[PDB]
Amino acid sequence: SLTGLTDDEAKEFHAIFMQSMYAWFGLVVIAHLLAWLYRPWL
Amino acid sequence: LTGLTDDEAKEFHAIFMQSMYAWFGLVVIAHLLAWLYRPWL
Amino acid sequence: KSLTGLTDDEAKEFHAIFMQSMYAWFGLVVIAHLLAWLYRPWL
Amino acid sequence: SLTGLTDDEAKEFHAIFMQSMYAWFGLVVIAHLLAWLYRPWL
Amino acid sequence: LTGLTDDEAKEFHAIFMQSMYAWFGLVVIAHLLAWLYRPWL
Amino acid sequence: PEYQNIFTAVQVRAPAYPGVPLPKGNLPRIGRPIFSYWLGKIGDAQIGPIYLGLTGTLSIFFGLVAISIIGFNMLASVHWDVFQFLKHFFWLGLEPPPPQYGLRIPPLSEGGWWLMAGLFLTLSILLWWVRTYKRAEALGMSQHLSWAFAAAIFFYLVLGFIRPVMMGSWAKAVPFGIFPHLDWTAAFSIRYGNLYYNPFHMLSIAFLYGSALLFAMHGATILSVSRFGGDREIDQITHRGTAAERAALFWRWTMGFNVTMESIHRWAWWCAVLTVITAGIGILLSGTVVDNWYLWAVKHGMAPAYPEVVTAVNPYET
Amino acid sequence: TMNANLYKIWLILDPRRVLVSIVAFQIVLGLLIHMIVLSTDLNWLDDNIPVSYQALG
Amino acid sequence: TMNANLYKIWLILDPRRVLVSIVAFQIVLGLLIHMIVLSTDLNWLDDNIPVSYQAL
Amino acid sequence: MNANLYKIWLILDPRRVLVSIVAFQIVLGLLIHMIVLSTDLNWLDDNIPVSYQALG
Amino acid sequence: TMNANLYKIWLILDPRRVLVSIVAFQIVLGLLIHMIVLSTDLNWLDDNIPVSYQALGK
Amino acid sequence: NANLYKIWLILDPRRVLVSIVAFQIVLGLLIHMIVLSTDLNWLDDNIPVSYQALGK
Amino acid sequence: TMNANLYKIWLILDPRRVLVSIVAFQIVLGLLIHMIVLSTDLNWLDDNIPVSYQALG
Amino acid sequence: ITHYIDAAQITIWAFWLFFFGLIIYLRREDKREGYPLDSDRTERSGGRVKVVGFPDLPDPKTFVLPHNGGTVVAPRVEAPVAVNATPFSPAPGSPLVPNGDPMLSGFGPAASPDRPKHCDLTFEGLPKIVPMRVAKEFSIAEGDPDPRGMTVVGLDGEVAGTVSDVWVDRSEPQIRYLEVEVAANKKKVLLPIGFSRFDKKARKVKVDAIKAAHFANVPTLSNPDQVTLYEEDKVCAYYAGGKLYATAERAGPLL
Amino acid sequence: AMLSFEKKYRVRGGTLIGGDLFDFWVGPFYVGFFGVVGFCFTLLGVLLIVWGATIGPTGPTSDLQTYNLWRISIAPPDLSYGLRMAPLTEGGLWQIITICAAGAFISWALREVEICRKLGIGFHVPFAFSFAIGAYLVLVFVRPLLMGAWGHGFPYGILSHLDWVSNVGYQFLHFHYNPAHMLAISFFFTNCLALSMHGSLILSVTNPQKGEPVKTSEHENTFFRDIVGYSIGALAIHRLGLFLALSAAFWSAVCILISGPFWTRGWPEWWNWWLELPLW
Ligand SMILES: CCCCCCCCCCCCCCCCCC(=O)OC[C@H](COP(=O)([O-])OCC(O)COP(=O)([O-])OC[C@@H](COC(=O)CCCCCCCCCCCCCCCCC)OC(=O)CCCCCCCCCCCCCCCCC)OC(=O)CCCCCCCCCCCCCCCCC
Numbered sequence A, D: 001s002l003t004g005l006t007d008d009e010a011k012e013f014h015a016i017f018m019q020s021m022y023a024w025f026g027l028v029v030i031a032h033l034l035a036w037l038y039r040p041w042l
Numbered sequence B, E: 001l002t003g004l005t006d007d008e009a010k011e012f013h014a015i016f017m018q019s020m021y022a023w024f025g026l027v028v029i030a031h032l033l034a035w036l037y038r039p040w041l
Numbered sequence C: 001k002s003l004t005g006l007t008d009d010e011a012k013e014f015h016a017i018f019m020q021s022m023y024a025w026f027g028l029v030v031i032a033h034l035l036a037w038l039y040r041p042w043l
Numbered sequence F: 001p002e003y004q005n006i007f008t009a010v011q012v013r014a015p016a017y018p019g020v021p022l023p024k025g026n027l028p029r030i031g032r033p034i035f036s037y038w039l040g041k042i043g044d045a046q047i048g049p050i051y052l053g054l055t056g057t058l059s060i061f062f063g064l065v066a067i068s069i070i071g072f073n074m075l076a077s078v079h080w081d082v083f084q085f086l087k088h089f090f091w092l093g094l095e096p097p098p099p100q101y102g103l104r105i106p107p108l109s110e111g112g113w114w115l116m117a118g119l120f121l122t123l124s125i126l127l128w129w130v131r132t133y134k135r136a137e138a139l140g141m142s143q144h145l146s147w148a149f150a151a152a153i154f155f156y157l158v159l160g161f162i163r164p165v166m167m168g169s170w171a172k173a174v175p176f177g178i179f180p181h182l183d184w185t186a187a188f189s190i191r192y193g194n195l196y197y198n199p200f201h202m203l204s205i206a207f208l209y210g211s212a213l214l215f216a217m218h219g220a221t222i223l224s225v226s227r228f229g230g231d232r233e234i235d236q237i238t239h240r241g242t243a244a245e246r247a248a249l250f251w252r253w254t255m256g257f258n259v260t261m262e263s264i265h266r267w268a269w270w271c272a273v274l275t276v277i278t279a280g281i282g283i284l285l286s287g288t289v290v291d292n293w294y295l296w297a298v299k300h301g302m303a304p305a306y307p308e309v310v311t312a313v314n315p316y317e318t
Numbered sequence G, L: 001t002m003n004a005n006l007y008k009i010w011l012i013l014d015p016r017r018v019l020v021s022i023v024a025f026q027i028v029l030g031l032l033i034h035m036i037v038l039s040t041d042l043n044w045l046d047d048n049i050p051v052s053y054q055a056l057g
Numbered sequence H: 001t002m003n004a005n006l007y008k009i010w011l012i013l014d015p016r017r018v019l020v021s022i023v024a025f026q027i028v029l030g031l032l033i034h035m036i037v038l039s040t041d042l043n044w045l046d047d048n049i050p051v052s053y054q055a056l
Numbered sequence I: 001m002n003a004n005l006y007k008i009w010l011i012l013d014p015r016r017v018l019v020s021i022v023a024f025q026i027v028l029g030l031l032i033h034m035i036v037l038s039t040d041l042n043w044l045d046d047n048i049p050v051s052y053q054a055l056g
Numbered sequence J: 001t002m003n004a005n006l007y008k009i010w011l012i013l014d015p016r017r018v019l020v021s022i023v024a025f026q027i028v029l030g031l032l033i034h035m036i037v038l039s040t041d042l043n044w045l046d047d048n049i050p051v052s053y054q055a056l057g058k
Numbered sequence K: 001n002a003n004l005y006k007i008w009l010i011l012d013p014r015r016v017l018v019s020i021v022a023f024q025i026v027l028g029l030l031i032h033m034i035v036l037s038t039d040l041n042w043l044d045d046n047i048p049v050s051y052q053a054l055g056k
Numbered sequence M: 001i002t003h004y005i006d007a008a009q010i011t012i013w014a015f016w017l018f019f020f021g022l023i024i025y026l027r028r029e030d031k032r033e034g035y036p037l038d039s040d041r042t043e044r045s046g047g048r049v050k051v052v053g054f055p056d057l058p059d060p061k062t063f064v065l066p067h068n069g070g071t072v073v074a075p076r077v078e079a080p081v082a083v084n085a086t087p088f089s090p091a092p093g094s095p096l097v098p099n100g101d102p103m104l105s106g107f108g109p110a111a112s113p114d115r116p117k118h119c120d121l122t123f124e125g126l127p128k129i130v131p132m133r134v135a136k137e138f139s140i141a142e143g144d145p146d147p148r149g150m151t152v153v154g155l156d157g158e159v160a161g162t163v164s165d166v167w168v169d170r171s172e173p174q175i176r177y178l179e180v181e182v183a184a185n186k187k188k189v190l191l192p193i194g195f196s197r198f199d200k201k202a203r204k205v206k207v208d209a210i211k212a213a214h215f216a217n218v219p220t221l222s223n224p225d226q227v228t229l230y231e232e233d234k235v236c237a238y239y240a241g242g243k244l245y246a247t248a249e250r251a252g253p254l255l
Numbered sequence N: 001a002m003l004s005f006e007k008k009y010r011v012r013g014g015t016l017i018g019g020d021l022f023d024f025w026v027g028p029f030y031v032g033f034f035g036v037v038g039f040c041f042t043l044l045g046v047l048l049i050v051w052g053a054t055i056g057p058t059g060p061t062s063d064l065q066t067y068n069l070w071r072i073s074i075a076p077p078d079l080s081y082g083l084r085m086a087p088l089t090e091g092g093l094w095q096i097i098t099i100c101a102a103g104a105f106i107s108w109a110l111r112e113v114e115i116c117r118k119l120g121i122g123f124h125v126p127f128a129f130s131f132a133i134g135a136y137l138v139l140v141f142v143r144p145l146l147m148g149a150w151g152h153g154f155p156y157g158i159l160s161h162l163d164w165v166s167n168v169g170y171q172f173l174h175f176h177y178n179p180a181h182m183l184a185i186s187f188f189f190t191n192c193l194a195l196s197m198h199g200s201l202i203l204s205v206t207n208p209q210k211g212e213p214v215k216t217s218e219h220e221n222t223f224f225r226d227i228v229g230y231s232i233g234a235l236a237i238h239r240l241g242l243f244l245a246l247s248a249a250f251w252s253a254v255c256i257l258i259s260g261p262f263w264t265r266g267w268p269e270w271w272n273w274w275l276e277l278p279l280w
């Protein structure tokens, strides 16, 4: 492969990446509900 | 030539196309919500 | 032997895919202008 | 042969070049026929 | 001095002059049409 | 007579250098290098290859959009007439939004294109900054270029972004155009009571002049000792040679003191960087802190006084 | 009509550079399109819908 | 009228460089044309059609 | 999503991507805040709940 | 009246370098000519023919 | 002259063609731009008719 | 009245470079002279002779 | 209200504080070579007194050389090196006069430090500066004459020899030295490009620095296929000595 | 005092004028004939500047006399004096100081030539310094001469000479459009960029990241090829920097030399030759 990761290392990285990204996106959603409740923009 | 074998090009293409179509599906949904909210034509 | 590196069979295959893809692109171009002409004729 | 084409290769390319050029010029003439009919400028 | 042999310089000159006269011939025709349409002197 | 080492009289060629190998994660370089004989008369004949990853690709895209938005509006301002675009090119510009819109996004027809060109050039430059940082990191080099570039970006940001926001109006930023941005420069000095009396303007001039002073000195010094290999500054710095020794003595004997082969580049680095640091501060203070630099200079006792040989009655008093 | 041998395009164009250029192009396009629309009648931020918040103060 | 040996063009012009240039030219041309039309009477964004959305 | 999308980390450096996302997201966050402050939605100078300069 | 040996032009000039140049020139000339025409009375975009579409909304 | 063909023994036929082609295109553009700057302008002369008037 | 041995000028000055300099100089001169003439009373393009073609519209 | 102090005045004073701190920083960096100074105060103090001025010297930095080349420190204690000259006057500030034949004195513009006895290296670790005989991948750029076979003339127009090879920089391609087979002794000596003017039409290299007969004493290379830093400086300095020493008129003055 | 490697370079001779008479150092400074001559011009000029500050424009008792560093000003004569010498208290002091400065400047450059001769180095530095001298002489000699009065020179005052620049510039309405001025500024700006680029690169390859060895010529070339697709080279960057700095000075001299002697109208109107070309 090109990045030097093995196949299982890419598998492990991908699983932690997707969980962390979903947690980040979850925070963004919470923030927009607070913002919509406080100051709806549409 | 990019140095991929034929089977790697098959595998990359299938994931590329499935991923691109998923991105395109989001664009359509966004435009359906936008068209319903503020039709521009 | 060629100046691009492709053999004759490879160039025939690329041409076939190139022409099919380009006509598919041009087909998309035409539909947009019919929609645009029906929506906002400019001539 | 300064470019590196043989004499037969230079003959084959010329034939295809002139035909493609004329086909382009045919398109240019057809386009200008429509423009003169639509919006004569002289 | 350029690499062309004497015969090559002869053959190139014959085609060059023939082509340039064709180009100059076209130029006169275009000028004739321009003068008929919009005389400028 | 002697060889002055201005032009390379006899160039040699070798197969193009592809560059020092970069660590994994960097993209392969692109381009087949070519040689220019005429570039090789004054310097290196190789052109290319180039590195282009995501940062530079994103940077160039932002930058091409920005440049095209400017040019499009220039061409539109002479009604698509390409001949009049060439006639008036130096006069044409893309104008900031009218003051009535403040810092709000203005209409496409009256200032929206400027704000978009300004946004995308700014992002393009910021991404280019990251590029300068990454190219040094991949070579194992320190970040002096990106630090100096940041100082230039600071000044650029003050002119078009920081000060207009502080002043509450995009109308106070700089238009995109050759002569139009010169109008802005002169009008800015007029409006703020003569920029000559801005002390950071004075400092910025001192450092801009000093950069030409220092590069003339250093440029000329190195060519005069290039007969001793003085242009090879890496090994003159690690292993002082008679090039570096004779250079220091020329200056020591001229003006009483001297630097080293390494430390002249520090003097040069700081002189150039301070040019744009002081310029940003000077503009940052104009309108925000000081409204009339001459009267500010009068107030602190700096403005020269002259015998009165002309004078004018103020018709607003009468 | 899609071609069955279209996958061979990745024998011609480098897949990594294509991915990098698409991401770059789309970030630019996304910002550019959002800004063009904000400079027109379609602007959804300064349209005072559902209300103008600068007037409540 | 097209030639039967037109496929031989890929023995002359590099397929890779041609494809990249086409999509680059078409993307730039498409941006340009959208720009021109917006700057004219044909503008479809600021035409208040179907309605003006800027409320008082 | 495809089952083999994880193979992206065989083509893209994981460490570089992670860092580039953080910087992209921080810049995006700064950019979007600045946009909203330039609109009617501005929440700092809206005098809501009250004007604090008007108290002195 | 062309010359029978005119094909020999591709013994002198590189066909590849020639083809790219024609494409670039034609693209630029096409862009150039379109702009010149738009700058004149011949403008087909801002002529409000068949109708003016901005009036429809103002 | 009968020995004029020897000019190709002195001047490179390939660069002369390129210089002639390059010079002729620029000259052609230049001359059109000159004529269009004068009374002879045939594009903005409202002949046969003014098309902008046709749209008012 | 020319001299019989004037041909020996080409033993001193390169005939190719002279040719290219002559061609370059003459083209430059012709462009310069036309623009000079076009900038005087003698201008033959904007003189409305035989007629003003803008006045036809 | 009104106040004399304002932010522009505060900030400009803050700049002066920064700037004078910067100047002292820079002056410290400037003293990493050549210091402490050689004075007659240090002689008479028996070495107790080191002349360093203000500011004082920085703490030493280290340069790590690639390819296990060792460590360089700056500033560094350098052993005094004898000066091959005697004072024109015993008074302080007087010049010195080279001993013996000036060309061979290693003094004045003939002088040079003792650089390291190793070869500058390419990134890959090969000797950087080498003849074209060794770096067979090098060629002369089309359009320029090949210096090999050109005739080398001294300041007086006399034939010093023939160019026997060309020494190039493998890291950043350019000619650095011409190799001259000296007619008088058949030795092969380096000639720096910095001292060479090409007369292309004559295929002659003109060297204004020295006479034809001075080529016999160009310092010689220990190894004919590479050049050490030490040898580079000794070679260049010998030609440079001719600028002042090669003829009588060169001593000056004009009037 | 001497640099620890300096003594082996302190050679006798190489003077242009003076020989053994003035061939000596004073501390670090080399003196020589042009050292003696330059010192006299300099000390006189400086002391006459201070005397002008002492008496001010209208005598030491007036309110206009000041030792305030920004406000001290020694001014050239009224234009009515033409190319003649004015009285010392009516601009003649300025006129004598100008000659001292030119003599001080030219003596400095010739001293540098003698130093180059001692060190067997090229003459690039005094040659380059000549461009700065030429610009000063364009300002106080050539341009005043072509217009017919030494009073077109600029005054010797830290802030008062900026007033001169300001009012001379605005005589042409919008001095920014001077073509030699635009070209000169481009050189001044390009020089500053190039200087920061050069300084940065040398410091970054000799002071690499911690744990790294000193970098190589290959790193330097690769680094700017990676950023801009081109590297000019370590010798040529010094060639470039000298060219940019000298070009900035040369076009400065050109841009002020044409402002008055070769052009009297506004500078924007100069560009009407472009606008009026029969192409558009
Ligand atoms: C709104 C802003 C918009 C900006 C947009 C920019 C866009 C980009 C954004 C991203 C920015 C990222 C920044 C970098 C990220 C990290 C980089 C990194 O690798 O860090 C590790 C980095 C490397 O570590 P290292 O081990 O040192 O490695 C060094 C190498 O080995 C080799 O090192 P070396 O051996 O070469 O040495 C390094 C060098 C260090 O130089 C630098 O690297 C930085 C250069 C400065 C750049 C900024 C200009 C500063 C302007 C100041 C003037 C302002 C006027 C007001 C004055 C206020 C101050 C009082 O050494 C020196 O030059 C010494 C300098 C001494 C300072 C002056 C001396 C006097 C100080 C005061 C004296 C006391 C006063 C009273 C005295 C009384 C008696 C007189 O850490 C450092 O130590 C270097 C710090 C430099 C990085 C940060 C600063 C520069 C970058 C930001 C510049 C921004 C300019 C904007 C200014 C705005 C106006 C004020």
Ligand code: BCL
Binding pocket: B023, B026, B027, B028, B030, B031, B034, B038, G023, G026, G027, G029, G030, G031, G034, G042, G044, I032
């Ligand atoms: C009246 C007009 C509408 C509106 C009309 C639209 C429409 C219509 C669309 C968007 C789209 C987007 N809008 Mg908008 N938009 C509105 C207001 C906003 C505001 C705001 C502060 O008011 C913000 C910050 C956004 C933000 C966004 C982005 C999430 C997105 C552009 C992404 C992009 O360019 O990716 C470029 C980067 C890439 C393409 C990389 C591709 C790689 C993979 C496939 C993507 C991973 C990145 C990440 C997951 C993308 C997040 C998208 C998902 C919804 C999570 N909208 C208003 C209310 N907007 C687009 C969208 O949703 O796209 C699907 C879109 O088509």
Ligand code: BCL
Binding pocket: A024, A027, A028, A029, A031, A032, A035, A039, I021, I022, I025, I026, I027, I028, I029, I030, I033, I036, I041, I043
């Ligand atoms: C009316 C408009 C609202 C408002 C609307 C929003 C909305 C809507 C959002 C934000 C978001 C954010 N806003 Mg805001 N914001 C307001 C006022 C402010 C003020 C202020 C001075 O008034 C500040 C300083 C901030 C600051 C912030 C950040 C905490 C955050 C963006 C982080 C980022 O870009 O991360 C990019 C960095 C990364 C991706 C790195 C990876 C993740 C890291 C580890 C997260 C770091 C910790 C994180 C910042 C903690 C904050 C979580 C809280 C739930 C907010 N807000 C007002 C009151 N703001 C966003 C947010 O909360 O995101 C969850 C968001 O969606």
Ligand code: BCL
Binding pocket: D024, D027, D028, D029, D031, D032, D035, D039, H033, J022, J023, J026, J027, J028, J029, J030, J031, J034, J037, J042, J044
């Ligand atoms: C009032 C003036 C008329 C008008 C007058 C003309 C005239 C007259 C002509 C064109 C031609 C062209 N016009 Mg127009 N044009 C109008 C409005 C438009 C608008 C618009 C937004 O309104 C657009 C986008 C275009 C676009 C175009 C291009 C499709 C084409 C030139 C391409 C070129 O330079 O190729 C250069 C590139 C190459 C030579 C490389 C090789 C070509 C390749 C193999 C083929 C590419 C596709 C090809 C151009 C298809 C043409 C098909 C139809 C005839 C349109 N027209 C208005 C209504 N237009 C030209 C044309 O049809 O050419 C045939 C032409 O002569």
Ligand code: BCL
Binding pocket: E023, E026, E027, E030, E031, E034, E038, J033, K021, K024, K025, K027, K028, K029, K032, K042
């Ligand atoms: C009075 C005003 C007249 C007018 C007067 C003239 C006159 C008079 C002449 C031209 C000429 C030209 N005009 Mg005009 N022209 C008018 C309007 C136009 C408009 C327009 C948008 O209105 C356009 C785009 C053109 C375009 C052109 C070109 C077809 C041609 C220049 C080619 C060249 O430089 O070759 C230089 C390049 C080369 C020599 C390269 C070598 C050969 C190449 C590879 C093959 C080129 C094919 C050639 C163009 C075929 C066309 C000949 C036809 C008879 C037109 N005309 C109006 C109506 N035009 C010239 C011409 O016809 O030339 C024959 C010319 O002398």
Ligand SMILES: CC[C@H]1c2cc3[nH]c4c(c3C)C(=O)[C@H](C(=O)OC)c4c3nc(cc4[nH]c(cc(n2)[C@@H]1C)c(C(C)=O)c4C)[C@@H](C)[C@@H]3CCC(=O)OC/C=C(\C)CCC[C@H](C)CCC[C@H](C)CCCC(C)C
Binding pocket: F209, F212, F213, F216, F217, F220, F254, F255, N041, N042, N043, N044, N045, N046, N049, N097, N100, N101, N104, N105, N108, N125, N126, N128, N129, N130, N131, N132, N155, N156, N157, N158, N161, N245, N246, N248, N249
């Ligand atoms: C040509 C490109 C640039 C350049 C290069 C240049 N300058 C140089 C050199 C070079 C190559 C030197 O070798 C030389 C040097 O030794 O530098 C350390 C020098 C130098 N350039 C200097 C200054 C300098 N150069 C400047 C500009 C430039 N120099 C260029 C833009 C400027 C500007 C822009 O204003 C100044 C301030 C000095 C540091 C030094 C020359 C030192 C010298 O000649 O000393 C003898 C003279 C004195 C010590 C003072 C004489 C006093 C007079 C007798 C009376 C004063 C009259 C004066 C006109 C009053 C001015 C008053 C007001 C204007 C404030």
Ligand SMILES: COC(C)(C)C/C=C/C(C)=C/C=C/C(C)=C/C=C/C(C)=C/C=C\C=C(C)\C=C\C=C(C)\C=C\C=C(C)\C=C\CC(C)(C)OC
Binding pocket: F067, F068, F069, F070, F071, F072, F075, F105, F115, F118, F119, F122, F156, F157, F159, F160, F161, F173, F174, F175, F176, F177, F178, F181, I031, I034, I035, I036, I038
């Ligand atoms: C038709 O043309 C084509 C397409 C063929 C291409 C040709 C293009 C041409 C010819 C372009 C010519 C360009 C020229 C001559 C440009 C000259 C430019 C000059 C001299 C510029 C000088 C200074 C400009 C400055 C300093 C501008 C600074 C602006 C800044 C910093 C603006 C920043 C704006 C921001 C960050 C906006 C953010 C938006 C927010 C977030 C606030 O939104 C609410």
Ligand SMILES: [Ca+2]
Binding pocket: F095, F175, F180, F183, F184
């Ligand atoms: Ca303006």
Ligand SMILES: [Ca+2]
Binding pocket: A041, A042, G044, G045, G046, G047, G048, G049, G050
């Ligand atoms: Ca809304």
Ligand SMILES: [Ca+2]
Binding pocket: B040, B041, H043, H044, H045, H046, H047, H048, H049, H050
């Ligand atoms: Ca609409």
Ligand SMILES: [Ca+2]
Binding pocket: I043, I044, I045, I046, I047, I048, I049
């Ligand atoms: Ca609030």
Ligand SMILES: [Ca+2]
Binding pocket: C042, C043, J044, J045, J046, J047, J048, J049, J050
């Ligand atoms: Ca229409």
Ligand SMILES: [Ca+2]
Binding pocket: D041, D042, K042, K043, K044, K045, K046, K047, K048
């Ligand atoms: Ca007409």
Ligand SMILES: [Ca+2]
Binding pocket: E040, E041, L044, L045, L046, L047, L048, L049, L050
């Ligand atoms: Ca006429």
Ligand SMILES: [Fe+3]
Binding pocket: F218, F222, F233, F265, N198, N202, N238
């Ligand atoms: Fe340097």
